[PDB]
């Protein structure tokens, strides 16, 4: 995280009204000829972090 300052402006507002306790992030993988394998091992991810 760089040592800087920046403000966050609002994006959306959802009138949902449910109970939230947990969450999970998704991901997009890639499957090509350079990563042979089945649906459980033949994929590539890419460089990312959060």
């Amino acid at each position: 995280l760089p040592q800087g300052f920046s403000a966050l402006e609002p994006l959306v507002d959802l009138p949902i009204g449910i109970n939230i306790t947990r969450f999970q992030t998704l991901l997009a993988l890639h499957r090509s000829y350079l990563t042979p394998g089945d649906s459980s091992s033949g994929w590539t991810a890419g460089a990312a972090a959060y």
């Binding site: 402006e9 609002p10 009138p15 009204g17």
Partner: protein, 50 residues
């Protein structure tokens, strides 16, 4: 059929607009806040979400 649920409402459709006057002491209700004053043009520019 009408449903009542423990959630904020989404359909009310008030409508009932009114024209505009300037430089005259009039009562105004722009979005839900009341007041009693005069209107004119301002030079300051709001941020897009203000």
């Amino acid at each position: 059929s009408f449903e009542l649920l423990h959630a904020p409402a989404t359909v009310c459709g008030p409508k009932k607009s009114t024209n505009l006057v300037k430089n005259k002491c009039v009562n105004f209700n722009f979005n839900g806040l009341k007041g009693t004053g005069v209107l004119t043009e301002s030079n300051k520019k709001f941020l897009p979400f203000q």
